[PDB]
Structures are given as C-alpha cells and as structure tokens.
Amino acid sequence: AERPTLPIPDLLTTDARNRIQLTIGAGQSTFGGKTATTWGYNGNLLGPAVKLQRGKAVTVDIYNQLTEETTLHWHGLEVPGEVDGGPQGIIPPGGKRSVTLNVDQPAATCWFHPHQHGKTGRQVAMGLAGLVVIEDDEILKLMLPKQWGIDDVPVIVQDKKFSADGQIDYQLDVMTAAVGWFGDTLLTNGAIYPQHAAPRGWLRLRLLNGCNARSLNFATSDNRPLYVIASDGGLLPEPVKVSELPVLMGERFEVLVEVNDNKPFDLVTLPVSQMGMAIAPFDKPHPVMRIQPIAISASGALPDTLSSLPALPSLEGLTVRKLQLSMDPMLDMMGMQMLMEKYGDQAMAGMDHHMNHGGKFDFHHANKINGQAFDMNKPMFAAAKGQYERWVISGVGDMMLHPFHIHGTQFRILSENGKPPAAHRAGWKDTVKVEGNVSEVLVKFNHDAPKEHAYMAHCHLLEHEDTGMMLGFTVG
Ligand SMILES: [Cu+2]
Ligand SMILES: [Cu+2]
Ligand SMILES: [Cu+2]
Ligand SMILES: [Cu+2]
C-alpha cells in the first residue's frame, strides 16, 4: 500500500473576539490498523498550531473535557507565571480556564503540552501536544518557505508502544522512573512513516522531539545536508549546515532541505547513545517520513543572514545558581537492572566502554534537584527579574540523559555538558543537555512569577520530572 500523507496540524488564529478555543478530550486513533484511546487538543490526537504575533495579545479559552485534571503549558513562550500553565495551573475536569498571552519575543516554533503534577509523562504519552508558531516583523522579510503544509511543515516526532489489545501501554514504574518511557513505534504528526509531497527547491521542516524520554538524531537517507535556520527560541544569525541534527526531548529546530525532481528521500533518525534507545528497530537508522518531490517550483529562499544575535555580556558579578540533579542510587540501579534483564546487552548498545520499606523508599520521589524531590508548595529560590543570571546544572553522579528546561525564558548556553555549544545550539535555547557532566546557561526572566504560580525548572525526560526532578522558582 502507499504511505499515508503527513498530517498537517491546522494553523489557528484568533476570532473577532480575539479568542482561540482549545478543547482537551479523549477519542480514538488508529495505529497499524488497531484502534486506541488517545487524547488531543481540538481532536483525538496531538493538536493544532496556534499562530501568535509579537506585540499582540490573544486570549485562549481552554476547555478540559477529560475526566481528570490537567494543565496547559506553552513550552518556549516567555509569559508571566500566572499563565505559564505549570503544575499549579489546574483546569478541573469539565471546566474551562482562559489565559491572555501578551507575546513579546522573536519569531520561533514553540509548542504546548500538559504539566499535570506527577502525570505529565502519561498525559503526553496519551496524545496531548500542540504547536505554537510565533511570527514577528523581521522573519517575514526573509522570504523563507512559508506555505503551511506545502513547503513549511511541522514534524512532531514521537515514539509509543502499545499493548496487544491496541491500547497505548504507558507506565510510570521503577524502570521508567530511571530510564524513561520509550517504545518501538515511531509516529510523525501521529502517523506511522508518512510521505510529504514537497515542491522543488527549499523545504522548511519545523522539527519537534515530542518523545517522553527518547533523544533523536535527524539526517537524510541520501546524506543531503540540513540547513539549520532556528532553534528553540528563534532564528540563528545565519544558517548552519549539518549532516546530522541531535534533538533532545522538547527541543525544536527549523531546517531547510533541498527537494530535487525525481529523487525521493527519507528524513531518518540515527541510533543514539542513550540507554534503552537502540533496541530494534532503533538499533539502525529509522525512517521518519518520505519526502516526495513535486515538479512545481517552491518560492522560498535560504538567505545568507537571518538575524542579529547579541553578544554575550560580561559574566563577572552575575548571580551564579547551582542546580545539582540527582537520582536515588538504589532506584537508578534497580531500574537499570530491570532494563538489562528485559532487553539484555542491546539496552547499552552504543554506550561508552523487593519488599515494601515504606514511603522513604518510594520511587515516586526518587529523582531530585539540590537534594529535594519537587515540592509544589515551596519554590526553591527567588530569581531576579530583568537581570542576567548564570545557572549551573550538574548531572555528575549518574549517567542518565537530562535535557534541562527552564520555564519563562529563552537563554544562551555557555557550556553544554562541559563543552562550548555547537554553532546551531549557540543561539536562543530553552533546553540544555546535562549528562554525567555540567552545563551553564545565561538566563534572564522578563516576567513575574509568584509562589502560587511559580516557574518550573526541570529535566524534560518526563518520567524523571514526574518522580521529582523539578523545582519551582519565583521571579519578582
Ligand atoms: Cu516550558
Ligand atoms: Cu516542556
Ligand atoms: Cu533527567
Ligand atoms: Cu516544563
């Protein structure tokens, strides 16, 4: 049979009352011909792309039609804590919450997802994620590929696994609390190995790693390069040519790739050096989508310059914050042992060369920052507003992968896991790799966040977050 076409999320803008309506609900999807219960925003799975303009406010009405509580966070958007949608931003089942977003950051591809306390991994795994397209006056002048669903397309890449009855097989247990929830099936905007018909010339892909725990590494099947034009928080100063593009959980990159007549190619993901993630079929390059060239000229450009990136400022005298990530050694050892017993040596491929003892020993609070599993009631510190700070995040002490995300900002990486950042990671980022080593970022918070609606800082390996690897902080 033919490949399904790549689903394209609807690009949503405000009504005359300046409102966007998002309904959160459950329905059915089909994978490999089997029905599964799934959750979506304005539909059964995944979500729309909300279009925002810098300097304009919009109001979002969010209707929770689930039978459990949820929250809605705008990952990558710089907004006050009151509308950030972290764990404190509860929307009761059957209820509605509205937020007004005053967009004040450069053009970028952001996304939105639940942030329910202790349950974010399950709610994302069940289907909830959407996109945010921010535009500003600067990016349209570049004449990039811009026809949504034709030469400008979002690519949300996620793994799942399913039980024999067809349902999503999600569990937060001792194994996944240590190494993450991952599966054997790869979805691309919700579809298994779709094709996308693209015109001849440049194709813009807005890539999102929407996996709970799996890192990805994009490349093309015939080794044509990818031209990175933007990261999490917006355009790079100029395109950066790469042959492969690692993408951590929750990160976005936009790339341009050439489309030539008569030569279809796949976007693929290459095996990564992360525990658990190279089990067949991920032990080999895995297709993500087929690009099918169409003999119609694409009008988009790849300009030599994209934007102006300001210099880093002097670092002397800035507040330095230490964030020590950690995992309880016993539950790290027990979850890694369960991974190895289940899959054997292949669970470490590509890597470098039972009774109840009480609540003190519960894996649900085994992962921590600065010695503390996430306490919704006690922000760990008060950060300055309108001030640059240097945050130092260490994963020394274990070897798991921790893509560390800070709400309320787009930062600059100074050191990524002990090395200067790669050029395409040197611009605006909301995520930094921490793995066995130390990262340092330069952050500034432009908006307030009070104790009652604090900003989160956390590992974006969702099962780590849900079992304590998160802190709250206030601003202002
Ligand atoms: Cu976020
Ligand atoms: Cu996030
Ligand atoms: Cu982590
Ligand atoms: Cu978050």
Swiss-Prot record:
Q: How is its activity regulated?
A: Ferroxidase and phenoloxidase activities are enhanced considerably in the presence of excess copper ions. A labile regulatory copper ion near the T1 copper site is important for the copper associated activation of enzyme activity. Ag(+) acts as a potent inhibitor of oxidase activity by binding at Cu(+) binding sites, blocking Cu(+) substrate binding and oxidation. pPD oxidase activity is strongly inhibited by sodium azide, an inhibitor of the electron transfer.
The UniProt induction remark is: By CueR, in response to increasing copper concentrations.
What use does biotechnology make of this protein? Triggering CueO activity at need by the addition of copper salts with minor toxic effects on E.coli cells could be used as a simple tool for biosynthetic purposes. The protein was also identified as robust host protein for use in biosensing and drug-screening applications.
What does the annotation record about activity and temperature? Optimum temperature is 55 degrees Celsius with 2,6-DMP as substrate.
Gene3D superfamilies recorded: Cupredoxins - blue copper proteins
Q: What is the effect of changing residue 398 to A?
A: Decrease in oxidase activity with 2,6-DMP as substrate
Q: Residues that bind Cu cation 1, according to the entry?
A: 73, 405
Give residues annotated as binding Cu cation 3.
Answer: 115, 407, 458
Q: What broad class describes the main subcellular location of this protein?
A: periplasm
State the InterPro entries in the record. Cu-oxidase-like_N, Cu-oxidase_2nd, Cu-oxidase_C, Cu-oxidase_fam, Cu_oxidase_Cu_BS, Cupredoxin, TAT_signal
Tell me which cofactor or cofactors this protein depends on: Cu cation
Using the UniProt record, name the top-level EC class of this enzyme in a single word: oxidoreductase
Q: Which UniProt keywords apply?
A: Copper, Metal-binding, Oxidoreductase, Periplasm, Repeat, Signal
- Cofactor note text: Binds 4 Cu cations per monomer. Contains a mononuclear type 1 (T1) or 'blue' copper site, and a trinuclear copper center consisting of one type 2 (T2) or 'normal' copper site, and two type 3 (T3) or 'binuclear' copper sites.
Family per UniProt?
A: Belongs to the multicopper oxidase family.
Q: What is the documented function of this protein? A: Multicopper oxidase involved in copper homeostasis and copper tolerance under aerobic conditions. Is responsible for the oxidation of Cu(+) to the less harmful Cu(2+) in the periplasm, thereby preventing Cu(+) from entering the cytoplasm. Probably primarily functions as a cuprous oxidase in vivo. In vitro, in the presence of excess copper ions, exhibits ferroxidase and phenoloxidase activities. Fe(2+) is an excellent substrate in the presence of excess Cu(2+), but is inactive in the absence of Cu(2+). Oxidizes the phenolate iron siderophores enterobactin, 2,3-dihydroxybenzoate (2,3-DHB) and 3-hydroxyanthranilate (3-HAA). Oxidation and thus inactivation of enterobactin could protect cells from the interaction of enterobactin with copper and play a central role as an interface between copper detoxification and iron homeostasis.
Annotated protein name in UniProt:
Multicopper oxidase CueO
